[PDB]
Amino acid sequence: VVDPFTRKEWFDIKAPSTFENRNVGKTLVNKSTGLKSASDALKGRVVEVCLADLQGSEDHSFRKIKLRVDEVQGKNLLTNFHGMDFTTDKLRSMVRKWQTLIEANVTVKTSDDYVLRIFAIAFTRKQANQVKRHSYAQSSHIRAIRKVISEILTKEVQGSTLAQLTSKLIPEVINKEIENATKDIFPLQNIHVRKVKLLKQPKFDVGALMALHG
Amino acid sequence: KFESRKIMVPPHRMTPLRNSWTKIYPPLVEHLKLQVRMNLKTKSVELRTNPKFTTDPGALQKGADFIKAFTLGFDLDDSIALLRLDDLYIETFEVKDVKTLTGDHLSRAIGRIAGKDGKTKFAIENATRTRIVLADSKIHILGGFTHIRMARESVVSLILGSPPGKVYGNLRTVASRLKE
Amino acid sequence: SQVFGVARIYASFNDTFVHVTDLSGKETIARVTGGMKVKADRDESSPYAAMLAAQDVAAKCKEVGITAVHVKIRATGGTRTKTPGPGGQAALRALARSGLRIGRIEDVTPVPSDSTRKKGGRRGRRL
RNA sequence: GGUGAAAUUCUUGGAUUUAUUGAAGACUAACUACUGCGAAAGCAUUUGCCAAGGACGUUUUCAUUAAUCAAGAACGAAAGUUAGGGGAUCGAAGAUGAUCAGAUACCGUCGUAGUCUUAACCAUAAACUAUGCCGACUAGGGAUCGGGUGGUGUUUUUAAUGACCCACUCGGCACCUUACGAGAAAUCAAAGUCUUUGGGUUCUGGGGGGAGUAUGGUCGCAAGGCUGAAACUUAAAGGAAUUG
Numbered sequence: 206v207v208d209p210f211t212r213k214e215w216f217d218i219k220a221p222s223t224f225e226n227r228n229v230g231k232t233l234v235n236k237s238t239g240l241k242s243a244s245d246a247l248k249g250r251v252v253e254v255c256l257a258d259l260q261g262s263e264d265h266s267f268r269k270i271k272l273r274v275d276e277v278q279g280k281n282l283l284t285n286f287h288g289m290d291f292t293t294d295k296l297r298s299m300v301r302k303w304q305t306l307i308e309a310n311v312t313v314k315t316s317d318d319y320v321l322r323i324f325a326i327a328f329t330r331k332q333a334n335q336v337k338r339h340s341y342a343q344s345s346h347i348r349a350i351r352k353v354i355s356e357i358l359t360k361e362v363q364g365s366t367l368a369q370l371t372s373k374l375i376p377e378v379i380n381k382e383i384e385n386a387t388k389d390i391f392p393l394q395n396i397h398v399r400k401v402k403l404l405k406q407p408k409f410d411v412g413a414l415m416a417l418h419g
Numbered sequence: 420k421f422e423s424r425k426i427m428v429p430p431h432r433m434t435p436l437r438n439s440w441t442k443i444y445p446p447l448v449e450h451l452k453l454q455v456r457m458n459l460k461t462k463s464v465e466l467r468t469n470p471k472f473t474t475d476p477g478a479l480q481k482g483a484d485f486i487k488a489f490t491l492g493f494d495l496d497d498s499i500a501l502l503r504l505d506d507l508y509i510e511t512f513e514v515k516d517v518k519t520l521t522g523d524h525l526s527r528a529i530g531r532i533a534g535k536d537g538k539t540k541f542a543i544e545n546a547t548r549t550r551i552v553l554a555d556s557k558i559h560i561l562g563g564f565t566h567i568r569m570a571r572e573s574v575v576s577l578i579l580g581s582p583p584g585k586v587y588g589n590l591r592t593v594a595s596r597l598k599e
Numbered sequence: 600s601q602v603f604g605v606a607r608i609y610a611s612f613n614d615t616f617v618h619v620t621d622l623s624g625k626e627t628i629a630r631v632t633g634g635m636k637v638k639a640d641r642d643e644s645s646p647y648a649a650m651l652a653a654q655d656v657a658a659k660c661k662e663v664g665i666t667a668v669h670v671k672i673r674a675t676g677g678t679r680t681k682t683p684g685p686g687g688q689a690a691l692r693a694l695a696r697s698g699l700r701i702g703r704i705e706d707v708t709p710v711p712s713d714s715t716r717k718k719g720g721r722r723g724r725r726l
Numbered sequence: 727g728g729u730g731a732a733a734u735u736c737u738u739g740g741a742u743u744u745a746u747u748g749a750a751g752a753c754u755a756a757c758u759a760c761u762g763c764g765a766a767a768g769c770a771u772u773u774g775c776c777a778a779g780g781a782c783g784u785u786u787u788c789a790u791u792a793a794u795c796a797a798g799a800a801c802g803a804a805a806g807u808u809a810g811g812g813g814a815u816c817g818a819a820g821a822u823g824a825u826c827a828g829a830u831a832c833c834g835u836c837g838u839a840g841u842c843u844u845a846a847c848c849a850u851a852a853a854c855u856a857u858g859c860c861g862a863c864u865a866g867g868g869a870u871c872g873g874g875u876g877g878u879g880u881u882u883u884u885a886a887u888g889a890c891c892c893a894c895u896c897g898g899c900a901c902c903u904u905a906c907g908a909g910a911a912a913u914c915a916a917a918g919u920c921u922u923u924g925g926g927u928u929c930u931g932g933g934g935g936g937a938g939u940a941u942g943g944u945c946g947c948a949a950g951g952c953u954g955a956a957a958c959u960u961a962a963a964g965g966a967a968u969u970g
Binding site: 210213218229230231232233234250251252255266292293294 | 602603622623625703705706
Binding site for chain 2: 730828829830
């Protein structure tokens with residue numbers, strides 16, 4: 206009988222400073238050996254957590270964050286932002302009959318030269334005095350709106366850091382900026398940035414990672 | 420301390436829920452000692468365990484399943500069995516899982532399950548002690564585990580195209596087995 | 600303190616898996632399946648077998664020291680059916696009564712944008 | 727793993743399951759409807775380039791230039807043929823497991839050709855709205871798609887535009903009620919304006935079998951396509967609807 210938990214060891218995960226509270230929880234690894242060091246088994250190891258926990262506010266409950274472990278010190282694992290996504294039950298609740306679904310996406314490089322891809326979604330809605338049932342839009346409108354949205358996303362990136370972008374997504378200010386630009390074209394509802402996925406990353410330095418923390 | 424569950428209601432079920440509301444909460448407030456509230460801001464209901472007098476975690480799950488079933492379209496007095504009995508489950512699938520068919524072929528299939536005046540559906544819900552709802556392409560079956568499987572095999576054969584009369588013959592046999 | 604794990608439940612026809620891991624998902628605490636707890640094949644999918652599997656896993660979690668657990672529920676998906684069968688529902692009920700604190704719950708069944716061809720030929724096949 | 731039940735198969739060198747990544751080929755879910763486009767077959771991720779088209783608007787231009795159509799010609803689902811590429815998935819043929827069990831009675835594993843694409847062929851479907859094209863007239867109604875006109879109307883803002891509301895109008899896919907009409911009846915705004923029988927024009931049928939056979943011709947590499955009898959036999963075959 207091995208009972209491997211004789212050999213396992215526990216570490217604490219420390220989210221970056223951008224988030225309101227940062228004790229994520231624990232993970233376990235076998236005790237280190239001269240043959241191979243444990244710290245190499247900790248590196249990578251993405252963690253996925255509900256944003257409503259990091260912020261302590263349940264209105265965020267349908268959004269999820271990925272964190273990737275990049276550094277180890279003193280049995281604390283120091284970790285960096287890695288992606289954002291919706292929960293699947295929420296997304297199914299938006300799609301309904303008698304309306305149009307609009308999507309846009311673009312790939313772009315941050316000022317600290319991460320390369321990422323970002324997805325936006327929006328839906329048409331009725332005017333308050335409408336009588337006809339189904340609120341569809343013509344294709345000339347859809348192309349126009351999709352062009353507008355693509356422009357905004359490519360200027361909100363080139364924020365000075367990947368961390369500055371994170372500070373934009375939490376208060377979801379960008380949803381309001383898209384709302385203002387499309388105002389003239391068509392009435393829209395449930396404007397959301399749906400997903401963010403990180404494609405490539407620069408040469409590592411500890412300096413930036415320590416600057417994000419104590 | 421605290422733990423809670425939240426479940427969304429689709430919009431066509433919203434109005435039936437309000438009309439029933441006065442009948443649905445008393446069993447949750449009384450029998451299970453849960454506390455519950457309706458959140459219109461996010462079109463959901465939320466259920467909370469009161470720490471002072473709840474018995475065991477089975478109370479919290481029983482509450483959720485009862486509300487869950489109602490949003491699928493089962494009647495209130497059919498859903499309520501999930502509080503009082505303990506062996507009930509829901510099975511669900513959609514016709515494209517069995518055979519791919521699209522136009523009037525698709526419409527004819529679900530019409531073959533209903534039968535005239537629902538008589539074919541009504542018969543299956545009697546020869547097997549179960550309840551069935553048809554929501555366009557999707558079928559949901561409520562009952563006991565062994566009963567579920569007997570219902571499923573019969574309805575699958577209707578969408579594969581067997582004539583309704585032949586299936587009646589099979590039901591009489593299955594119903595004889597459940598005389599036990 | 601709570602020390603959350605995460606429980607992965609995979610329900611299908613023919614069998615049900617119960618599986619639980621560290622929050623990072625790499626290290627596995629315990630597994631076991633319905634088929635391990637019953638004699639005959641025709642029973643591997645039964646809800647009864649699912650309850651036995653869940654009770655067994657929960658005991659070992661307390662022994663290692665996990666006290667709370669997020670849960671991810673999965674059906675076979677792909678070209679197959681997408682909603683977790685009754686075997687998965689039974690497992691979830693049994694975990695709740697174990698005294699573990701259930702965290703958030705999510706459905707993670709894989710869905711295609713649009714699929715490759717389904718098995719069983721043109722004339723259909725009994726699911 | 728798979729079934730009604732089970733066996734072939736994979737696995738302590740770690741199967742099934744979990745995590746981080748990568749490659750290939752195919753497909754385009756939900757939104758998706760009694761909605762749109764095209765001569766028909768048919769057509770659904772984003773952006774760019776190329777050329778085409780209907781309806782509307784018009785106090786522009788030509789001035790009978792038109793309708794239908796034997797010969798002749800372009801296109802034509804799926805499967806199929808020849809040569810090159812690609813080859814994830816599913817899978818005629820083939821090799822295999824069980825042969826027990828009446829609801830589940832025909833199920834399991836592997837897999838060639840094929841499924842995708844380029845260059846040439848083939849010319850069939852319940853290719854169906856089972857309703858030939860062009861023109862005129864005969865009835866009531868509220869919905870919807872594209873264009874246009876009007877409004878001292880709502881909203882985006884302090885204009886124009888956009889979104890919406892109300893009235894009218896040209897064109898289109900449909901729907902509900904009724905029958906002065908019609909019909910064998912089911913039913914039908916045409917299937918009406920027919921013994922009170924004539925607006926123009928193309929194609930096809932003449933009781934049931936023998937038979938889409940035989941023979942001749944012609945097209946195709948082939949599979950096959952188009953055209954197509956008679957001797958003889960028989961008193962019915964067939965359509966719609968209700969009912970014992």
